[PDB]
Amino acid sequence: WLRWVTQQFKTIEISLQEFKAALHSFFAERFFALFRSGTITLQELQEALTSPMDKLKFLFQVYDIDDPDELRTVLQSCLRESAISLPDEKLDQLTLALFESADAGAITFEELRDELQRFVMENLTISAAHWTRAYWHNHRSQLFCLATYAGLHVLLFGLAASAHRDLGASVMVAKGCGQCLNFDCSFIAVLMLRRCLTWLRATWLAQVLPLDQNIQFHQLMGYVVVGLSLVHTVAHTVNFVLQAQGSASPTGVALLLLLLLMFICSSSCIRRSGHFEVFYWTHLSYLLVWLLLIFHGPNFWKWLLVPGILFFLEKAIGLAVSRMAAVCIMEVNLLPSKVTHLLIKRPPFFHYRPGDYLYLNIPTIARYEWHPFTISSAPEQKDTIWLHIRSQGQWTNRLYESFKACNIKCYIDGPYGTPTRRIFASEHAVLIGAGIGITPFASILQSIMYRHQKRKHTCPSCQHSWIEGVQDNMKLHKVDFIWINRDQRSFEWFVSLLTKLEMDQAEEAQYGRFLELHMYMTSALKAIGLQMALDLLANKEKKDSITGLQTRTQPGRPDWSKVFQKVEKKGKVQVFFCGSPALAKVLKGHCEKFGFRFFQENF
Amino acid sequence: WLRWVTQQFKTIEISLQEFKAALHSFFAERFFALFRSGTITLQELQEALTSPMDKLKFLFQVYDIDDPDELRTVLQSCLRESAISLPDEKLDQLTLALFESADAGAITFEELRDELQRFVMENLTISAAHWTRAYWHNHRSQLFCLATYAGLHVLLFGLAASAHRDLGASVMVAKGCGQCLNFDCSFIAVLMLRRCLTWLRATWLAQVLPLDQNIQFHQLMGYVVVGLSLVHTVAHTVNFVLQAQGSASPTGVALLLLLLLMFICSSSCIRRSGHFEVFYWTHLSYLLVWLLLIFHGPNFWKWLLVPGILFFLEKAIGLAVSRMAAVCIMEVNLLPSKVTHLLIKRPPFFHYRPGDYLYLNIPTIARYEWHPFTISSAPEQKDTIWLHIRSQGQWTNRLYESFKACNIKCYIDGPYGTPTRRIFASEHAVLIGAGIGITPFASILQSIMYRHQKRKHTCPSCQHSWIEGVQDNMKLHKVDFIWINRDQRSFEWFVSLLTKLEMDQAEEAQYGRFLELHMYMTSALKAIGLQMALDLLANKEKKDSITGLQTRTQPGRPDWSKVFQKVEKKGKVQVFFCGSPALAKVLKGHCEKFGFRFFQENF
Ligand SMILES: Cc1cc2nc3c(=O)[nH]c(=O)nc-3n(C[C@H](O)[C@H](O)[C@H](O)COP(=O)(O)OP(=O)(O)OC[C@H]3O[C@@H](n4cnc5c(N)ncnc54)[C@H](O)[C@@H]3O)c2cc1C
Ligand SMILES: Cc1cc2nc3c(=O)[nH]c(=O)nc-3n(C[C@H](O)[C@H](O)[C@H](O)COP(=O)(O)OP(=O)(O)OC[C@H]3O[C@@H](n4cnc5c(N)ncnc54)[C@H](O)[C@@H]3O)c2cc1C
Ligand SMILES: NC(=O)c1ccc[n+]([C@@H]2O[C@H](COP(=O)([O-])OP(=O)(O)OC[C@H]3O[C@@H](n4cnc5c(N)ncnc54)[C@H](OP(=O)(O)O)[C@@H]3O)[C@@H](O)[C@H]2O)c1
Ligand SMILES: NC(=O)c1ccc[n+]([C@@H]2O[C@H](COP(=O)([O-])OP(=O)(O)OC[C@H]3O[C@@H](n4cnc5c(N)ncnc54)[C@H](OP(=O)(O)O)[C@@H]3O)[C@@H](O)[C@H]2O)c1
Ligand code: HEB
Ligand code: HEB
Ligand code: HEB
Ligand code: HEB
Ligand SMILES: CCCCCCCCCCCC
Ligand SMILES: CCCCCCCCCCCC
Ligand SMILES: CCCCCCCCCC
Ligand SMILES: CCCCCCCCCC
Ligand SMILES: [Zn+2]
């Protein structure tokens, strides 16, 4: 009640207030001025925080200044936090359309209220700001892996401790740290196999067990090896000093030097520099570490055997003939937001399902480094195979920098990935876009469009075109694309491709639509009447000015899930999603009531 | 010279002569009578063995008896060793056609000579009979596997012998036989894995190393295990008797009993009876043999480990969910020559390349027995998947007998086999039929015919049909089928299917032929003018009377290889064969001169 109002007042410097009000900013300054002479009196805040008619009148007063200034105000709003990256040339047309829709003098409060009610008023907002047990429980409810490693470490430490309890306070620590080190130095290698991980990635084992964070888990076990080796060294030295009142010590010293080298020369700072050769050559010293530790520990080979032989087999299966091939880059083009687009020539013998990935390796950038990239070209394209890479690290950033200022060697190794025959062998399989790996969705869309157009048979004689039914390739009659991601900051390639496919199939939607686009932001701006300008623009040119697409990029977080529940039926409809377990689980639980054979969280 | 004639006479009883002359036999008796009063005088043999005019006159005299009898003679010749299984109803038409072609009186020797010269005369023959270092070198020039096993056995026996030479004449034999037995009892199991063998079958390792005889090699090592175990037992007993002047002996006795049981109850005689359950249950005692031999030999577990764990993994990978599935037989039909044809319902999720195989298992016949069968139905058939089985053993014979006098459970386990994308992604890939596994060729032919007809697009509006080009499925323009096998004794299903496909595509050969058939026997009858009757019959009904097909089943062993060399070119022609290494090697060596990318001996 009144106490709540007092607390809100206590929660509350014009420039400081503007800065703290989530600034863009002429509109913000005008609103702050309209919010008297300028003071910290709580009456203005109470009035602002308190029917929709008053809010509409306040908004109308804020928009005006005493109505050509609205065009300048509209331009400022576009350049504001709305992130509307549009040219100023179209601003005149948008302002003219808005003035025509509003004035028909543009100072009429009643006209503004009617225009607002045409589309809202209840959502009277003028700001977006307010003015680790739960997270761990939520994340660990499906991970349950770090605790297992900790339990193994502790049980091994205790088991070695009970075996040397008689020795006094120094050698039992040594033995426990030692046994932990056999375990760690034996299995930190079996973590990383780039070959079998792909084979395991396409199974329910990968569905239940996370895989994509194996780099960070491997680095974490490297760190614990370093720490435990240091404490083991200190314990053995303090034991020797106590005894002070020839191969073991020198071999331990050599192992310590090797681990210190591998820790120093494999940190993030080294690979920040373009000395990938230095990192790889220093990091090839794992063989020397294993060889030294063989005849350093009495029973290290027992631990080393199984993972050692299995990793030796995994590395020995890779030859130039076995998987590798020589591919020459044909054309490379750089797109905005530091995304590089490659056009590698298709080898004569390469049949790949859509959505598969491959590992690229450019000798010029990194001589012996391999990174996975997802194919962004349809399998029906016989000329070139595309690859799309976003600069989210150093090596990709290195490629972008190098190509900033072509026939260079490239090596690709086969297609790998989950089979996509289930999507084509379905009826109205809707695809939901989430996460950062939305590259395979472009391949799937291109393949589906190509197969759809291949059945558009036209008779050359009488110029009659009749559509044949499904023929042994796909069984879909309609596909729905729904994209729910952080932004379109780096996916200009993907936006362009989806827009291209959309108006390529838009010429065929008069008799029946085949592809639907639902593009969401959930972070765009509602609270400011910027969409009023675009309302007329969308029908002015039959395409959104921000995208040049039939879809106008509607935001909305939960209403998208509700529409997914309310998604027309061309057959046994199926729902497929790809993202974090939270959103996928919510969508599945909502979808389970509707009786749909939906394999949600498929990725 | 004259000495050769004397030797030929020495190489030489009218009934006995007829029996030894490769009898069918009225024609044989007439020839023997025509060959005087009947004696062993060498003048008749000298005349017979010695221009084509004399041979033609002799043949004309033999055919006649003093010409309606020729029809009876023709019928006898058809029923003779020619193996012409044709009805007597068509004999009248054939005899009438032959008489019309010959007489126009049918006793004119000059007319017979002219008719023979029309088609021969130089190949004047009236008989087909004459009147292990080389084989081992030829076979072992590519096998080199039994010698390796013998060498391993001998080196192990010698190694154990040198380790116990001090012991007197009895225990060194024991130790050598023992070490040989660890080796044998460890690897006789790693021979047989029905899972990894399929994975290895599709590689060049299977191309160089034979695989299909693993049953017989496994049985041979079982036999040597039995023999060496018996001699080991005798040696240890004679050692103990010498010492005669408690777990080892009883465990050895138990192992001896188990091996004797497994030898007795797994012989051919037991499975000759329909007691497959008895064989399988008695043969499940290998686990007991291994368990007893673990704590019977001091160092048997070292040998047992790797093959034991690997076989345990191979058997543990097989579950009902993992590979197995429930399939109900829809229709079963029995064809002549003891071949059974099955029509099993296609499971909803089953995509298989043509030519793949599967393992059938009928609980009614054998509860826990598995045998591989090759799919004889095109992948484009969505209704049922075929299987063709020839009664070449007991279990198949058991199935034939049981179905001689349906909804029974059947279990299939996936498709396995070499990929066939290379055939479709080629130009004029000619297929050569040899060996006994010609079942996948029917699947390949059906798939190629179906894909060829799927591009025969006809406009419904104006009834105009235009053929489209190759579309992402195959790149062939012409396929040639050449069949060089022992007979058509059991392949009536395959003959019917190829004939069906041929006249299905015969309606499209006027503008361009798509499938060519070259059916050979190399064992049929030349020497007897039976083909004269069929010469008119072939054009009488546009189909051979023996087959009802455009092809008339031409024989000829080496001329087929010459024609394969002289095989028209619709693109980059490729040659594929399947059979024993001899014929395939000859065909490849002949083909290498022509510069054809032929992967001969592909099977
Ligand atoms: C199977 C797979 C396919 C991918 N496909 C694409 C794609 O098509 N387009 C795209 O823009 N991004 C893709 N990524 C994400 C990422 O951009 C790529 O893995 C890229 O190779 C990053 O390399 P980097 O040199 O920048 O890594 P770094 O900058 O050296 O490492 C930092 C980041 O890269 C990851 N990383 C580093 N090394 C590896 C490695 N060996 N394996 C996996 N992750 C590693 C780390 O987890 C971390 O997130 C994919 C990731 C995976 C696992
Ligand atoms: C991969 C493969 C696919 C085959 N496909 C066909 C087909 O489609 N049609 C056809 O008519 N024949 C086929 N055969 C040949 C043979 O007829 C089948 O293997 C059939 O299962 C014979 O079983 P059986 O009970 O008569 O064997 P048995 O009578 O018990 O054994 C005698 C013969 O069968 C073979 N044999 C026995 N057990 C096995 C086994 N477990 N694995 C392999 N061979 C064995 C022996 O080598 C010997 O030649 C195939 C063989 C193989 C290896
Ligand atoms: N290999 C992989 O697939 C992989 C690897 C690592 C992590 N991940 C996933 O990626 C996540 C990190 O990326 P993220 O947080 O951006 O994605 P996310 O966790 O998969 O999804 C959460 C985001 O989805 C959006 N969202 C929520 N409800 C929505 C609705 N009704 N309609 C539309 N969008 C809705 C929200 O806004 P925004 O759209 O603005 O974000 C929210 O931030 C991780 O939590 C994990 O789930 C995947
Ligand atoms: N899994 C397998 O693929 C498998 C397994 C075991 C054995 N095999 C092969 O099968 C063989 C046993 O069967 P097989 O001897 O009947 O076949 P084959 O050895 O493959 O072929 C030999 C036969 O080919 C025929 N032939 C020779 N020259 C010919 C020509 N120019 N044109 C047409 N035919 C010609 C001959 O008469 P016929 O046609 O009257 O025989 C000859 O008997 C083995 O030697 C081995 O090569 C294959
Ligand atoms: C035990 C031994 C060892 C150790 C000690 C280690 C230690 C370590 N680690 Fe290591 N790694 C290893 C073993 C190792 N490691 C190996 C072997 C490899 C290769 C890969 C695979 O395996 O696959 C690696 C790899 C690796 C990587 C990647 C590379 C590539 O990819 O190329 C990384 C990042 C790491 C990290 C690490 C670190 C940071 C450390 C320190 C702390 N590594
Ligand atoms: C690389 C990691 C590492 C390192 C760094 C080290 C370092 C060392 N080290 Fe060592 N160790 C080890 C690893 C190690 N290490 C282990 C793991 C063990 C346990 C045992 C085995 O392994 O077997 C030991 C153990 C050990 C021993 C023994 C114990 C028993 O036996 O129980 C000794 C004497 C030692 C010494 C040493 C020294 C003195 C040093 C410093 C110089 N070393
Ligand atoms: C070392 C142990 C052992 C031994 C002693 C034997 C001995 C023998 N073996 Fe034995 N097996 C065996 C181990 C064996 N095994 C096994 C484990 C099997 C199963 C199969 C597999 O592995 O996969 C058989 C299997 C078997 C078979 C097939 C069956 C089925 O498939 O189901 C046969 C035929 C035999 C034979 C034989 C004989 C005849 C003998 C006597 C001589 N084989
Ligand atoms: C199953 C097959 C078999 C059988 C049948 C047998 C049978 C027998 N066994 Fe014997 N063992 C054996 C297998 C055997 N086993 C072997 C493999 C050996 C070598 C050693 C091990 O294993 O480790 C022996 C060895 C042996 C020994 C020891 C020698 C050494 O240590 O060097 C003895 C004492 C015996 C006894 C015996 C007897 C007395 C008999 C008869 C009863 N074998
Ligand atoms: C910090 C996240 C830890 C995730 C651990 C991943 C474990 C991967 C196991 C791979 C087994 C082959
Ligand atoms: C009598 C013919 C002997 C053939 C030997 C075959 C050997 C098969 C080796 C299989 C290795 C997995
Ligand atoms: C035996 C001690 C293991 C410690 C593991 C701690 C993991 C921390 C992850 C941030
Ligand atoms: C150690 C003795 C091995 C004998 C092998 C003989 C093989 C014969 C194949 C017919
Ligand atoms: Zn037409």
**DSSP string covering B488-539, please?**
SSSTHHHHHHHHHHHHHHHTTTTT---EEEEEE-SS----STTHHHHHHHHH
- The helix, strand and coil proportions of chain A, stated in percent and rounded to the nearest 5, come to 50, 10, 40
Question: In whole angstroms, what is the distance from residue B399 CA to residue B388 CA?
Answer: 12
* Pocket perturbation via mutation, ligand 1, pick of A215, A371, A386 by most ligand atoms within 8 A of CB: A371
Distance between B459 CA and the closest CA of chain A, angstroms:
6
Element (H, E) at B591: helix B581-592
Nearest CA-CA partner of B215 in B198, B191, B199:
B191
Question: In whole angstroms, what is the distance from residue A599 CA to residue A422 CA?
Answer: 10
Question: In whole angstroms, what is the distance from residue B106 CA to residue B68 CA?
Answer: 9
Angle between helix axes B286-294 and B248-264 (nearest 10 degrees) is 160
Instruction: Give me the residue from B454, B459, B471 closest to A459, CB to CB.
Output: B459
A-chain residue closest to B382, CA distance: A472
Q: Is the CB of B216 under 6 A from ligand 10?
A: yes
Instruction: Give me the residue from B351, B461, B472 closest to A459, CB to CB.
Output: B461
Question: In whole angstroms, what is the distance from residue B351 CA to residue B355 CA?
Answer: 12
Nearest CA-CA partner of A314 in A195, A200, A413, A186:
A195
Question: In whole angstroms, what is the distance from residue B83 CA to residue B134 CA?
Answer: 33
Strand partners for B358: B373
Instruction: Give me the residue from B380, B461, B471 closest to A464, CB to CB.
Output: B461
3-state class (DSSP) for residue A21: coil
Q: Do A461 and B457 touch (CB under 8 A)?
A: no
Strands A574-576 and A429-433: parallel
- b/e B562-580 (16+ beta carbons within 10 angstroms → b): eebeebeeeeebbbbbbbe
Nearest CA-CA partner of A602 in A441, A375, A486, A485:
A441
Residues of B in contact with A472 (CB under 8 A): 380, 454
Using beta carbons and an 8 Å cutoff, which residues of A are at the interface with B? 351, 380, 421, 454, 457, 459-462, 464, 466, 471-472
- Ion ligand 13: residues, CB within 5 A, are A 459, 461-462, 464; B 459, 461-462, 464
Class of domain B421-521+556-592: alpha beta
Interface test mutation site (partner B, options A461, A466, A468, max chain B beta carbons within 10 A)? A461
Using beta carbons and an 8 Å cutoff, which residues of B are at the interface with A? 351, 380, 421, 454, 457, 459-462, 464, 466, 471-472
* Pocket perturbation via mutation, ligand 3, pick of A563, A580, A590, A591 by most ligand atoms within 8 A of CB: A580
| Cβ neighbours around A229 below 10 Å, total | 22
In degrees, rounded to 5, the angle at the alpha carbon of residue B551 between the alpha carbons of residues B545 and B553 is 75
B245's tokens: 């002047």
A337's tokens: 């937001």
Helix spans in B374-417 (H): 395-404
Residues 6+ apart with CB under 8 A from B435: B485, B578, B579, B580, B603
A380 is in an annotated binding site: no
Question: In whole angstroms, what is the distance from residue A530 CA to residue A4 CA?
Answer: 33
Pair B360, B387: CB distance under 8 Å: yes
- Measured in whole angstroms, the distance separating CA A154 from the mean position of its chain's CA atoms is 35
Instruction: Count chain A–chain B contacts defined by CB atoms under 8 A.
Output: 29
B330's tokens: 């829809």
B81 is in an annotated binding site: no
Instruction: Give me the residue from A454, A459, A471 closest to B462, CB to CB.
Output: A459
Q: Is the CB of A297 under 6 A from ligand 6?
A: yes
Residues 6+ apart with CB under 8 A from A599: A422, A574, A575, A576
Beta strands (DSSP E) in B264-345 are 326-335, 339-345
Distance between A459 CA and the closest CA of chain B, angstroms:
6
Residues of B in contact with A462 (CB under 8 A): 459, 461-462, 464
A-chain residue closest to B380, CA distance: A472
Tell me the residue length of chain B: 603
Strand partners for A481: A431, A517
Give the ligand 6 atom nearest the CA of A181. 17
Per-residue CA distances from B443 to B384, B421, B438, B447 (Å): 13, 13, 10, 6
Solved how?
cryo-EM
Give the ligand 5 atom nearest the CA of A185. 1
In degrees, rounded to 5, the angle at the alpha carbon of residue A217 between the alpha carbons of residues A215 and A219 is 70
Residue B283 CA, ligand 7 centroid: distance in Å: 7
Residue B193 CA, ligand 8 centroid: distance in Å: 27
Dihedral pair phi/psi, residue A143, rounded to 5°? -95, -65
Burial of B475 (0-12, 13-18, 19+ CB in 10 A): middle
Pair B587, B599: CB distance under 8 Å: no
Strands B574-576 and B429-433: parallel
A250's tokens: 């020198």
A212's tokens: 């994509």
Tell me the residue length of chain A: 603
Q: Is the CB of B210 under 6 A from ligand 10?
A: yes
Q: Do B464 and A466 touch (CB under 8 A)?
A: no
Strand partners for A335: A339
CATH 3.40.50.300 for the A326-411 domain, yes or no: no
Helix spans in B141-275 (H): 146-163, 171-191, 196-201, 204-208, 214-243, 248-264, 268-272
Question: In whole angstroms, what is the distance from residue B594 CA to residue A20 CA?
Answer: 84
The residue whose C-alpha atom lies closest to atom 25 belonging to ligand 1 is A395
Per-residue CA distances from B530 to A597, B58, B77 (Å): 67, 16, 7
In chain A, what are the domain boundaries?
A: 2-118, 144-316, 326-411
Q: Do A459 and B454 touch (CB under 8 A)?
A: no
Element (H, E) at A543: none
Question: In whole angstroms, what is the distance from residue A393 CA to residue A399 CA?
Answer: 10
| Cβ neighbours around B127 below 10 Å, total | 12
Q: Is the CB of A574 under 6 A from ligand 6?
A: no
User: What ligand is nearest to the CA atom of residue B177?
Assistant: 8
A44 is in an annotated binding site: yes
Q: Is the CB of A210 under 6 A from ligand 9?
A: yes
Q: Do A466 and B461 touch (CB under 8 A)?
A: yes
- Measured in whole angstroms, the distance separating CA A425 from the mean position of its chain's CA atoms is 28
Residue whose structure tokens are 């059945």: A455
